[PDB]
Amino acid sequence: FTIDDFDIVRPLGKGKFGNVYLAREKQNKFIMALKVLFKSQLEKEGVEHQLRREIEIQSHLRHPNILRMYNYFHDRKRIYLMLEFAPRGELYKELQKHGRFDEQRSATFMEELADALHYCHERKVIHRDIKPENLLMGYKGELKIADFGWSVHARRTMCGTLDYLPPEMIEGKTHDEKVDLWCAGVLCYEFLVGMPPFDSPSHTETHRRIVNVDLKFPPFLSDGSKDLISKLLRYHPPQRLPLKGVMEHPWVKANSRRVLPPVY
């Protein structure tokens, strides 16, 4: 493959380590996203090994709620990633625009997320950075896990995002796949509320609220959503509701309107 095998339609925006373009593969007239990475830039920033780990994980994952990497090619100066195009774009922009999601929208995303994470966990892949900014939306608004920047095939690596950090990470303990259970609970809360649960003016007060699980549910939340969130946001990782438990949760069953995209 070469860039000449594609018609670049338009830029989609800045992605991690490079610009993303909407492109059509001339032969099959197939619309996809094309991420362009500059080989020298990757070397200068010292992110080659970090990009290789992400490509290695994302290219071997095949799930309707995981953004697909079809293939990759390179020339003298650039590495091109042939990626699934998610037509509805950034989930965070949608959250920002609406302020908060309704129960249907949130439960659908939770079912899609738990299914994608279960698929990962089954393959010993821990995401470690589930948050709205790492999610894209498909043609029918279906969730697409799009960033695997902190992911690992398995830990002590202190990683993720402040508001989403599990207690065990803040406390410098070893962690396992159960960090994704905690982040799923923080995500569910943020979807429904519009803000993460332990939001505070200072890092020390956010750390304090996380370790004490200082969860203060707004009165507009249903009993069902609070039930799911409380079951995920457990201080002790083994007490956290498993991903199969999220999928089976009565609030998810009653509210999700998940549709599986057509297969070939």
Binding site: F30, I31, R68, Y70, N71, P87, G138, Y139, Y264
Partner: peptide, 22 residues
């Protein structure tokens, strides 16, 4: 646009990407 219709058609009639690209 004509692009919007092609994106729609791609969702409903997906291609074997594993064979075409993989």
């Amino acid at each position: 646009n004509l692009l919007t219709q092609a994106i729609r058609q791609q969702y409903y009639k997906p291609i074997d990407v594993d064979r075409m690209y993989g």
